[PDB]
Structures are given as structure tokens and as C-alpha cells.
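Hi,

I'm pasting everything inline rather than attaching a file, because the server keeps stripping attachments. The sequence lines come first, and each chain or strand is labelled.
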Amino acid sequence: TAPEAALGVLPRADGSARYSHAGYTVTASVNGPIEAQRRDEHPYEAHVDVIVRPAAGVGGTRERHLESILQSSFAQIILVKSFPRSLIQIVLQVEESPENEYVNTKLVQASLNFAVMPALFQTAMLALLSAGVPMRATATATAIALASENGATKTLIDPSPRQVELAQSVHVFAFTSQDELLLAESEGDFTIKEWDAAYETAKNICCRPPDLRHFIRSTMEAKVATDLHWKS
Amino acid sequence: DGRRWNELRRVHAQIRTQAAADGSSYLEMGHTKVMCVVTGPSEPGKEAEVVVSIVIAGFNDKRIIEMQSTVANALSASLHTHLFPHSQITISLHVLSQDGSLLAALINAATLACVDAGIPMTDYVVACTAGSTSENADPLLDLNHQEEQELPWLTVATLGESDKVAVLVCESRVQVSRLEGMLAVGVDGCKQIRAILDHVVRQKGRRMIRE
Amino acid sequence: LALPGQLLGPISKYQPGPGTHVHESNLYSSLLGTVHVTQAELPTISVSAAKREILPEVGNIVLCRVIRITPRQAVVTILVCGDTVLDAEWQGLIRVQDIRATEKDRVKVYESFRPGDIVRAEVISLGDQANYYLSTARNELGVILATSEAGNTMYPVSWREYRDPITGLTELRKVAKP
Amino acid sequence: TFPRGIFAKLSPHPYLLRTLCPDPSNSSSTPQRTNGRRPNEARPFRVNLGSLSHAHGSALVRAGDTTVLCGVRGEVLPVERIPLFRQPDVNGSATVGRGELKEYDLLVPNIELATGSAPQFLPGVPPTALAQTLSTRVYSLLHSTRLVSAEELRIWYRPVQDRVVAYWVLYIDLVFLSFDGNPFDVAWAAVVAALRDTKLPVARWDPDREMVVCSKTETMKLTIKGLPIACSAAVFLEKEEKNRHWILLDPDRLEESLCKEVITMVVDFSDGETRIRAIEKQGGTVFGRELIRSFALVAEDRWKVVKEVMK
Amino acid sequence: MTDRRRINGPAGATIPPVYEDALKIRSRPSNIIRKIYLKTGVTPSASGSAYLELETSANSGVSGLKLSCTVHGPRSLPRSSPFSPHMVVSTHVKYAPFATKQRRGYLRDPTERDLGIHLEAALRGAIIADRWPKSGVDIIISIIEGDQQGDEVWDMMNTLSGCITVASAALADAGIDCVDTVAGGVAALVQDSDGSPEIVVDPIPSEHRKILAACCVAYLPMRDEVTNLWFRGDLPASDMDLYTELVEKGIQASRSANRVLVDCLTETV
Amino acid sequence: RPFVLPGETIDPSLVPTHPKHPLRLGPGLRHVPPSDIIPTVAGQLITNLNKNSMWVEYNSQRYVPTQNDLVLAQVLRSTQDSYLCLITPHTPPATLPHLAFESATKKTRPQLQPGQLVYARVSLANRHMDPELECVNPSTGKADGLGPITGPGCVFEVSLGFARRLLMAKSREEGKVGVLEMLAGEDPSIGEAGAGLAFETAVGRNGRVWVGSEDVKTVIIVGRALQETDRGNLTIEGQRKLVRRLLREMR
Amino acid sequence: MPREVEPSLSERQFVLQALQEGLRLDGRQLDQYRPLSLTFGDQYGVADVTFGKTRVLAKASAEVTVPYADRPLDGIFTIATELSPMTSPTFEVNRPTETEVLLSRLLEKTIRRSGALDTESLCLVAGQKCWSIRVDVHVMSHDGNLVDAACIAVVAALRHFRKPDTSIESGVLTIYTPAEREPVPLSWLHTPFCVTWSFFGDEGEIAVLDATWLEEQVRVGSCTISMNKHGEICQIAKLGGTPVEAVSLLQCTSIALTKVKEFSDLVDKKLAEDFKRRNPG
Amino acid sequence: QHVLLSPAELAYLHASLSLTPPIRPDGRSPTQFRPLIAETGILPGANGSARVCFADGTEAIVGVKAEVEKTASWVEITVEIPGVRDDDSGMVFLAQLLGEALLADGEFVKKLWINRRYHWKLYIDILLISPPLSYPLPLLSLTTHLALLSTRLPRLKSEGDEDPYFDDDWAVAPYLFPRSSQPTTRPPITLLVMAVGNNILFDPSKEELAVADVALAVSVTATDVDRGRKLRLLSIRTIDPPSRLTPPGVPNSISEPIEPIEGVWRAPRGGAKRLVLGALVQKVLEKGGVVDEVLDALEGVELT
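And the predicted assembly:
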């Protein structure tokens, strides 16, 4: 219902974070600018590596897509230029996902999981800020899914996995603090008119005068002030 | 069967078996048979690295690499790895037949292969496989393949006559009480297998110095 | 337009040259190309393909981009060979002693060159390694194009130094006499 | 100095700019990218079908230099082998399974960038990331599109209660001989074309043999639903007055290298109403809400041309 | 065994198609070599390339066998690899997923590697390695279709002849020096209405009732040399004189094959 | 008091439009080409008005080099012109001049064992170039305690912020870190009347802090107190309570 | 990247001397076992075990797959441990590690040899259907006894997991959707547990029960005993080390059982505390 | 495999082999083979086994095990070089060559036939105990031949129309490829023929092979005479002269030499010459040829 997260969960890591919302629990590790294996290394600018670790089973091809998307989006947020040859490592392990009571477990799935994406983008951003990596801006992402059975259209937000299969179409969005779309993905049978309504509904998380912008700030604020208790 | 617990399978060991190798060994414990050929301390085209390769003749990949890792680490403590930094040592072991206690034969045969190569050894490293045989007690020194399925089998490797154990591996369950009697048995076997091994090294040398 | 193996000429009439494999006193072409002849010394024949992908040869001018600058050397991809752009890219390294023969000890990599610049240099020698070796010692050889640390395109002011136009800042680098 | 072609490999990005926004010239000054095709311009699709004899369905898609060869291979999966089989009900006298195609993994796509495809992509190495991410993309779209029906693949016993003895399994494998253009765009259209060409043999179970059997001289055609076709583009930005943004459609390899944001849209016009089956943007702030919507207009135009190519 | 890398089929094993329950000799032997279609430039990005097609029977019945070759220019070798004054030549041949039997791309079947070495042996002789140190030329062939225990070898020989023929074409398009064009060739011995002796320049296995022996040669026209020869038979030593013919017919086949290559390269490029 | 997040430009009013001195810039602030300063990290802004600097303080565990910083480096290997050392694990290796150490000549050079702990002042830090560590300021000709360490010791990890406090002169009082002094027995509150314990401390901006005492027991006590305080910011009283607790466990 | 991080030699000396004196950097005696926190995820079959700074989480999956042709009768049970780049920056995805290979095999044998899981219960249809119970061991942070932490998690995760119920109607098995039918407990006979011992001195003089990472790089060799509370020992693994006299080895096994029992009591209690909250009664 | 040699020494070897009298490094005549020490039955627990040793010191143990399988590949080869992964391409080719010889025999496959719907399968494992110092095909051919000879297949008391049955006592089991005393076939032999210029040489030395102008592997099988033997050629294949993979020689001080000078060794650029290939085959296939000498000695080898 309301997002809940914590920072510094993994002590040894340069930065770590845990996020829980919509029945999705992610714990993420961020490693500061690091020497980069030459095959991975790009000289002029840094290469950000994202590893998505499934809660159960082994990394699927879909899991390879979910990481590629996250890297491209996060690189604009991150300031790749500052550290020339450094490797920024983001590792995410999902501890829990909402169960689908209506189908038995299938370990390997090829489809692109739009439902886990919204939790990861929010999870990583929290961890990266703990790392201190230089960033142009901060971005938040949620996902919207549309169902037609009710007639007209019913908007379902932060969807569950059973919901996306029953739903006619799914759409995931992500916004920078400067309100602009960094990533957008949708699958199903839908119309641009319905999409624009999902974009403006998604826009609400991004601009406020749930409240994602406040959540990240508040979560950071408590740790920041907690860290700065020494100023006294 | 037909073997007293104290008694061990017949052993025939050959040293410098390979006509042209830095070091070689051939060990047969009963029916099990092992051949070892060791490249001398040499540099590939800090402490020295030992590679162990075991090839099972056609008559589980995880079991092999586990055995390879075991022989290497055991030999590595006995071997004076520290003396030559840049050199690499390679142990190639091939098994013609199996009667159980395979690991023990490999570590025994390999240790015989090392002393031939002349690589400095802190001491012979020798191992046997012993079992409890269920409160009646007839602990056994040499385990047949038949006997290992029936009874729990423990493989123990020692630094020669000393009670010290470099390797102890048991993949079959035993109650803690039975263990204390099982290891000492194995330890007693090791000195026997060292004795035959030391005889094999000494007899060849007597002929070599004679020749 | 001879195919590989056309019997170009008897060894007596002409001398072996690039693109020609000579066997049994009958020189033959080794590549599909348009033949040429140079005409004391007999004439030389050659066959040339219509990108040549030529291997760097010592003493040849090369244009190249600096991947990194390091205290003892410079690491530079050899992007182009004179008149032949290289579809195949071979790395090349420039030594501190090689950048400027004058004032050798005073010459430092950081002041001479900077990443992202494009340099013009000869091949001092073959690699003796995976990385070929080059030198910018000759006065003519120097950074031909540069991008400022700010990112602004830099226009040369003096041989030792480059000026960033908007910044007004000046960065020291060897620049080409021509 | 402007040594022709020598300049391009150095300072590539600026060279694209000069040609993109020509200074006042004795020319039309139309924005021409290094490819020679205007931004609104697009690579011309060319599809030829029925090439592969061994495969059940075959289709070759060409977008200039880029090329894709798709083949449809049919295999029969015994109902007993698949885990979790439950006999279907032809008609019912509100619970939905994951899907007959999904739970039984009846369709197995795989996109294979050849080692020959690009200087960039080479053999003897585990699959490259672009090749893997594209494969799942085709899989996801195929199940969301419902392009191939699950019912058509079933095999029925037809007892003189009727029951399903097995499901036809359709393997789709694709190989790029060359890669100089956007990968996905060429592939999906090839997949749809290949599935259309698929002609699985009519199959009947023989009770005495107790084995599923296929009949020579018997031809059935898979019924494809819709003709979803896609168009993909990438933005070029003059940065290394807000920086100028240009949209580049069906990009060439180099353009992919010097452009950091892409968009791919999948749309079907067969129903007569524009329908957007999937959208994807990444790596840039250029593709705002207004740009996204109007890309579908370019997509609609791209859809209209593709149907002429695909008979 | 599910690849973390690639999409996976159903865990249960699939079953191939099963169908419900005498080709005349195609053409004259000497000119029997099937008409071939070779074009350079199939892939531009690579330094060179070529595509070869063959007609299953007579003229243009179907495109039964189709080869696409990709040669990479003299390529900087891996830093860790030992320095070599000789140009490294490496051949990789992968059967496509579309064959009579589905062949996994990952598998790199034993049948496939065997071809790579032969092709590696044929091309290697032709290339002049002394002129390009620290250079690695990578020859890659992807086979679209195959031609069409004992029957397997004969089909394989034909595919080899085409792979060496496309490779010669590929090597030319790239500036890769070649002592001579290397052309593929095939030959075999067949028996027809008690006519055991005759040799056919192109095997065409299915048409022939049984094939006694066959050879595949890679003659370098203009240089009296064979880079690679491999032959399967059960030939009596007393009958060896025919082996000389069979080998000589193979090289006669190669010269014919060379004509296509020379013509395509010679024709407007 | 101002709180910032990445991408939220500092307002112009907070910046001082009195350019008698061009403004030096602290961590977490980046300068765009127009005269706008944009935060690049999450944290709380500090005006530092008396200084001509602004910095936003963020406690992280990984150190990116800054010139004239003091680092606790470890020597990995030797090269002909230089000694190669690592500032922090998995960093790009640093380059230490062979001749940097005080009194050094081409005829007289100190030999530094592989794995020897070294203290160094960062000579140069350029994003484009690998770091370089100097032993002695060239003008003084003196290292001033900067250099290799031979004493019996151990290096303990620390949060960069807790490290900053130690390096700062006012470790006690404004800094709020005085456990080092508490264990020393200078403070009256502890009440142990122990007359103190002898510890040698070398603190570095790299985040790794060296503590050395002749007694093995000394090193662990100081260290655990130091490490426990980093991981959990401690009310000075809590720190007092912890040192006593660590002290009692000692025998 | 350097494949392995090496402790500075000056550090390596302090730990050896501390251990000889009996003092430990951890601040706790040699016999000690670091404090254990076991927390079960709300979802069935997820367990997170934390020792000091090291955390490992284990999740259990049970798909129905086709049996291997070699052994049509037995179902497949796999323990998958993957060292992660989050664990330490060194570890690289898709690349094997020496520790990663051994951890999976040692653990896999401990459950299998004890045989708490039944191969007979796993098979549904002899020909074409078998259960695929699995546990994925995720290493969150690598300090000390990764093996010991994974074992307590694996054994805990397995017991907590519930299989999808199965019922055979008209002689036809039907795997039941979770909504259709309630889940089924794991049919667990007895519980194995694993304990690792580390020796730090030539001749194996010093033995440490739980090893910190820094301690782990210094130690000469180590042995891990896998023991059921009742005393039946499923596995013993002194795969290699500087020679340690047998008498000390045997002594460490009796101590181990005392450590095993206290573990068994916690896990059984912890399973209860959660069960009561979910199903009060 | 892949021996490394200086430019000069390779130059001396090439010329020595070139001289009208073939002055080989070891003084072995073209036909003569190096001493070989072999045993049969070394490997226990197999229907057949063998082991061989060379002057080089390269050695191997090869075992052949068979179980009837319903009438899929009839003969299976496995090679296990110590430092070589199974995936390595060279080994698979080598294994293929060995397999080509046996399967094309016709007699060998015919020997394996038992029933229309049941057939004997021969599983061969070839193991190189010695380090792979030099090219290994020569040893593998003789070893496999010997083991095949030793292979004993149990006698089938089935009338041979019905599903088959076998006898327990192994001695009854007929030897595969029985001795001469019906015409008696010989298990196949696969040997390497080297040629330097016009001269042809056999049992090539590792140091010799590097200078090879041409190299072929010819596989022959014979029908015993119960002018010695009637021989049959089955498989020929070209092993790339390792020569190409060698250092160039700097002439004593012209991108390619206008003329080929004496002291310099340049990797042999061309391929084999047609005239050479046929004669090379002729020598191997000649009656009274080297083949009969080798094969007869191997028949002479003690069995079990």
C-alpha cells in the first residue's frame, strides 16, 4: 500500500538498500567506481553493470533484458563521465515476489517481467544514493496495468503477477526528477489515448506539490540526519 | 573376503615405470590399479602450483574434480611447494580398474610418483580406507568395493608414520562413537602402506646405485 | 584486374613487388587487383586491391587516438594509415622518451598528450609485443585535434599549448608543425 | 582539412552533424545522414519466402545490408511427456491457466546473430547480450500478440470422448548473415512472415501403431492472427538553447553506436483501427509524451508498406 | 540442461516428424558439375564474403544447398596469445538449425568440426602467412542446407567442396593474399546395370544405387597442387589404377568449379 | 542546515556574490558552464562561509583520490621507476616515486617490502591519469612522519566520515570522536585510574586507519571501539559506555 | 581486476599472534560461534540466515519435470550456490570459483547422505513425471563460514517449503494449483546440520570454530563435520590442510555435536514461533 | 604435438631429407620403423585391451567394450589426451579418421552383424598416458589395431535367427579378427606417410614432420593368404604440414625472394603436388610393402 525501504542493509558493500512494496522485496548492492576488467571496460567513460538475481532458479534470458533496460536508464542518471574507466556494479537479489495462487511454479520463463521492473528502479536509486555515485538527477518508476472486463477501463497500479496475465495490457514508466520519461515499456492490445492516460497517471508519482518523490527524499532524509547526528 | 582386518590387499608398486618421464608410479591394491606420471618442476610456456588430472578408463564430473582437488591439496602439504616459486608441477593419474578405496590408491600412487621425480617431500603421504563394520567391533583396514556399499567407509591420509592426518573424507554415515576406532585403524593401515612404499623406493635405489 | 595466380611475368623481365608471389621464375599475382609497373635495376610489378587493411609498417605515418595516458607510456589505437583507413584496428604505444627527443627528462606524458586527442606519428618499430610502438619525436608529429577537459573544441595557440576558446584555459600538448 | 573518408573514422559524431544540418550550400540542403537516407526516410524492406526446403516454413527479410533468415521447424510432443497436462474442454458448461502454449512451452523461438553478422559479433563466444535480449523480446511479443493459436497446434485422437494425444511444437530459429541495421525490426517481421509460410503436415494417430503419425501429401496451414509489424528508431543529440534533437528511423549500425536512446513500436492496422501492441524507449529524455504518440504515425506508414512486401 | 543464455523448449523431449508408409542419373558425367551461383559482397561489414548455391537436379529445380561465408580481415590477435610471425588462420563451420536433423547451434557437432579442419587445411595452404605477422584471419561458414553410416561420408564430401569454393571467393574479396584460387571438387565410383567401372564427377548419392568410393580434392588451378584430399573406399590394391583416375577426375571437377569462382570474381564486382 | 538531493541546483541566494576570491568547491557540488552550482550527491549542504567553499557531507565507505590527501596505502609490487600501491581495495593502482622518500638519492633509496604498510600524501589526482603518492613535501625536504610503517600494527576499516573526524583536529568536542582519548585514560570520567594505555594511531582519508601498540591486547581494544562507533554513530555517552564495556571484557 | 584480495602481510601477522595468545580480532573466544539470527520470509520456503556480517538466503523451488533417462525412478534434488559480485567485487557472474564449486557439492551430500528427502516420495509417474525440489543458496555478504550458514538455511528453507499438493483421480495424477488445493509439508525425516573448523598454525596447533574472512585467508587448512543431532554424521571434509594430528580432529567432532544440538533447538523453535503466528491454535 | 624448432635446424632437416639418398637424422632407412614395445590384455574388465610404447616415449592404453544394441552409431571412439579438453577440434578429427578406417572396411562391420534387428557395437576408448609430446595418430592406429585383435566377443548359442543368447565361459568366445590358421581378414591399420620433396619416408619423427613438404594419412586393410598379401585402401586424409606454423629464416645480408637461397627455410606456401600424392599412395599399397611388415609384426605380438 505504502512503500517501505531501508539503506545500508548490507554492511560490507559500498552501498546497499532494501525496498518492499506491492508484495515485492528487493535487496540491492552498489559498488563504487572500481577497476574494470578490460573486456567489460570502456575507456572514455565508465561502464555500469547490472545483475538481476532471481529469488529462485537461475537467471533467464528475460533476466538479461531486465538488466539491460536498467543499465541504460541508470547511466543517464549516473555521471559516467567523472570516473573514466571505472566499473559501477549494481546487484539486485529479489527475496520475495507476490504469489500467483492460480498456477503452479514454473522456474524458467521467457516473457519480459514488467511487474518486477517498477520495484528495481526504485530499489537501485535508493542504493546508488547511499553509494554516493555522482548523479545528474534522481528518477522514480512505477507500472500501470489496464483491465477491460469491468467495461470502459479499470486502472490497476503496481500490478501483481496474476494481474498482468489477466489484464489486457501492461505499461511501465519511469520519470527523472526533471519530469521527463527515461524509460517506457508496454505490452498488450491498447490505444495511444489509453497510454497517455497511463502516462499522466504515472506522472503523479513523479510530480507532487503513492508519493514516490517524497518517499525517496524521506527515506534519505532519515539516514542523512541519522548519519549527521554527530554535527550536534 | 578371506582377509583378516589387520591384513591388506596385495600391493605391487613400480617406480620409474615410464621409460621417459620425470617421475612415474604404478600401484595396484588388490584389484584396483593406478598409474601416475608427473612432470618435473617446470615452467609453463609465491609458491608452485600442483595440477591433478584423473582419467577413469572406460570399463560424476563433480566427483572427479573433487578427487582431483583432494589429491592436490594433500600432496601439496607434503611437497615442499615453497622451494620453487615460478615452477608448475603436474600430476597425471589414470585408473585402469576400480575395487574401491580409489582415492587412497591415487594419493598413495601419486606420493610414490613424487619421490621418483625427486621433488622434495616433507614426508610420505599415505592413505587407506577403513570402516566400522558395526556393539560388536571388527574395524577393517582395506575396504572392498563390495564392503564399502555394505559398511560405512572412511578414507584417511596421514603424513607417514605420524598420527597426523592431512586428509580425512567420509561420505557415508557413521555414529560419532564408531569414528575414534575407525581413524586409528586407517592410521595403522597407512604405516603399512608406507612400509611397502618405502621398500619400493629403496629397492629401486639399491639397483640404481648398483647400476 | 588479374585473379590470384595470373602469370604476370618471367622473373627476368620484372622484379617482385607488393602483391606478387614468385614461384619457379614465373612471377604471379597474389590478390585480385589492377596491376602497375614502376619502370642497373629491372622493373617492379605490383597488384593492388580496390579498404586495403594494410598492416602497419615501420617508418609509416599513422593517425591515432589516445585511449589512455600513463606515466611511462601512452596507449593509442592506430585508427588510420596514410591514405588507407583501417577497418582492422591495431593498438599502438608511445614512449615518454619518444614523444620529444629534445629535453627528454623534462618531457612528461601528461603535458605532452591527453586522452581523446588524435596524434600523427611514425612507427618507430614493430611491436616486439601485442602493442606496436610509435614515436612523435619529429617536430612535424603532434596532436592534430583535441577535445578539452570541459568538452569544448580547442584551437591551437602555441606549439606547446592549446587554448580552449570559451574557457580561455590553455592546455599543454605537443602540436604538429604542419 | 577534409580528407574524404579519412575524416569520418576520426571525429565521427561531428561529421554526422554537418551532413545533418548542412550550412548554406548550393544544394537542396535536405538533412542527409552519412547513410545517404534522410531522417524521415527508411531502409527498404525486401522479403522472399519459401527459400528453405527442409524447414516447414521459411522466410528471408532484408533491410538493405541487414538480413534475417527464419525457418519454422515442426516437432510433435507427446501429451504424456509434457508436465502439467490437463485435457481441454472444447466448450464450457472464471479461472485461467497460464496458457497452453506457455505451460507446455509449445513455441520455442531463438534469434542467433551469426558470427559472420558483424565485425562486432564473432564466433566461439557465449551469446552476446543484444542477441539474448532480442530473443526474449520475440518470445514475449509472440505470446502477447497471440499470433499463432494454441488450438491449431493441438492433435486430436478423433475416436469413432475425443481427447488430445499431443501438441505440435513449433521451433523458430533465425540467423543474421549481416548486421548493419536495427536488429529487432527486421526479425519480428521475419517471424510473422515465416509463421505464415508454415505448412505443418496433417497428423493422425494410428491406434494399432500406438504412435502419432503424419501423412505425406497432406498439407495444413497455420492460421496467423493479425499482422503486427514494428518500426524502431534512435535519437541523435548534438552533445559530447537546448541541444538539438533529431529522430532517426531504422538506424544503421554506426548510428546505433553514436545514439544512446532508441524507440521500438509494434502496431497492427488490419482491424482498421490503429492498435499499439508494444512500445519501448530507453536512454534519453527526447521521447516525451508528444513524440511517442506521433511515432505511431510513422509506424502506421511503416505498417502500410510492409503489407505490400508481405503477401 | 536449460541455457541461462538462450530460450529453452519443453523439458520433455520432442519427437521428429513421422510419415505414413529410384532417381534416374541426372546428367552427363564430365559436365555433370551442377551449375553454381556465387556472388561476392553478401555481407559488407566483414572484410570479405560470398554466397554459393547449387541446383538439386538438372537445371534450377530448387536451391538445395546454400553456403554463406564470412572472412574477417587481418585481425589483431589476442594480447595473451603467443606472438606468431605466421598469420593465424582459423576456420569455424556451423551447420544451421535447418537440416534433416535439428542441429543445436551450441552443439558444434563432431560432424561439423571435422569439416572445419579440412577447410582449414585447404585454405591454409593457399594463404601467404609470412606477409602478415601478428595477424589473424578468421574464416567462417554458415551452411543453410546440406546436399540433399556409409551414406553420411558421401554427403559430407560435397559440402566440403562448396565450403572451400566459397572461402576462396571470400578470401579474394578481402585483401588476403592467395598463392592461387582454391576450388573444391568431388568424385566417386558407381555401378549402373553392371557398369561398375564408371566415375561420376558429382556424386549425387541418392541417384546412384551404391557408391564404391569417392574423393574430394582442392586443386589450386595454375599450380599443380592439391591442398586437401580425403577418400573413402574398399578398393582392391589390384584395382588401384582407378584411384588415380578418381583423384584425377576430382581435380578435373575442381577446374570446372574454379570457372565459376574466376568468372564471378572476374565479372563486374 | 540546507538539505540537497542530486539534481537540485543550490539557490543563487545561498551562494555569495562577493567574488573577492573565486569560490573553492567541496565534495558533492559540480559546476555547470553557466555560473550554476548543482549538487551531485545526497546530503546536507554547509555554507562554510568563512572559508571560500561549499560542501555537502555524505558518509560513504569508498574513497576517490583527492590531491594533498593523506592515505594509508599498501605496497603491492616494485617497478624500476616507481613503487605500486593501492589506496583502497579494487582501486586502480597508485604510483609512488622511488625517490620520493626523504633524504632519497639515486645512490640511497629506501627498500619497501611487498605488502608493507605505507603512509603517503597524494601527489596528483587527475581523472584522466592514475594516482601518484608522494612521501615528502619537496619544499620542506622532510616527510614529517609521512612514510612507511614498520611497527607492530594492524589496519582497521572505517567509514570515510568517521575518518574525517579523526583526521580533523577537533576530534573531541566539535568532532565528537574521543574514544581514542578515552581509552588513553586522559579523561576523568572513565574512572579506571589506569594511568592510561599506550597506542599509536595513523588515520587516513582512504578510510583505513592504522593502530599500533606493543601489546597485542591494546590493538584490538582500540580497534573494536573504533569500528563499533563507525558502524553505529554513538552518543558520546554511549561511546563512554562502550569503551568501559570493551574494557571490562579485557583481562 | 586481481582475482583474489590478499590481506596485507602486517595484518596477517597480528591475527596469527592474537590466535596464539588466544585473543581474537572478533572479540570472542576461539570456541565461540558468532550470534545466529534466522528469519523466515512470509512466503513459504524462504529462509535468511545471518552470522555476524555474513548473510545467506535460501529459497526452495519444486517444478514438475521429466525424469532423467538414466534413473527413471528417482526425482532430482539440486542445491545451487552462486557466489555473487554483490558478495565481493571480485566474484564474476557466469565464471566458476573454487569456493563456489565445493560449497554446492559438500552441502548437496549432507542432505543426501542423511537422506531426509526421499527419492521414493519424489517420483510421481515412473516414466515421465518427477518432482524437482531445489534450494537456491544466495550469498549476500561473505564473512566467514559460508558453508555453515548455507546448511542451516538450506535445512530450514526445505522444511518450511510446501509442495503443491497432488491427488490421483481415476488413476490419473493431477498437480493441483495452489488455489485449488492447499500446500503439502516437505516429508522431512531428520535434519542434518553442518559445522566448519579452521586451523591456523603449522602442525594444526590452533583451531578456530568460526572464521572471520581475514582469519579465513590466513588459516592453513580447515575441516567441516556434518552431523545429525542424534550423532549420525553424514559427511566429514578435511579435503586438504597442513597436517593436523588426529586427536585434535576427534576432539573437534565431539564439540561440534554440542554446537549442532543448540542449532537444532533454535531452528525447531523458530519454525514454531512463525507457525503459531500464521495458524493460531 | 606442435614441436618448436629454430629456423636453421629446420633448414638442416629439410635438406638432409631432400638429398637423393635420404640422410635422415636418426639413420633409419625410409622403410624402417622405430622400436616399439607392446602388450595386450593390459587393461582388465574389457572385451579387449592393448598398450604400446614408442622410442619417443609417447605411450597409450586403448580398450574396446561391446554390448549388443537393438538395430545410433555402430562403433564409438573416445580419446582422452591429458591436457586436452574433450571439445578440442583436433582430437575429434583424429578420432574421426580412426573411425573412418574401421567402418569403411565392410568386413569389420559385417563381422559385427548378428541379426537383422540386433547388432554388436564396439566402444573404443583411446587414452594417451604419456604427455602429448608429439603428434599421436601413429601410436593410436597400432594400439587400436592390437586391442581390436585382442577383443573377444562371446559366442552366441542362438541359432542366429532368434533373439540372441550367449555362453558364460569366456574362452569359448571367438576372437575378433582371428588369426590365419575361410579367408581371414585383418583389422585395419592407419599410418602416416611423409614426403620431403621427391623422397618419401615413414614412421615420421616429430622433428622430421616439421619440415614436411606434404603429409598424408593412408588407411589400408588386407585379406590374409592362407608377393605376400592382397591389400585394400580405405581412407586417405591430409594432415597439414606443421611446417607452415614455423619461424621464418632471415637471409644472410625483396619482399619475397626472387630466387630460393640455400640456407633459408621459408614455410612451404604451396600445397602437395599431384605426382607426389600418387607415388606416396603407391609405396604404401605395394605388395611386399611396409604395410605387410607392420601388420605381420602386430599379428606376431603376444595376445593377453
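The first strand of chain F starts at residue 3 and ends at 4.

If the labels don't parse on your end, tell me and I'll reformat.
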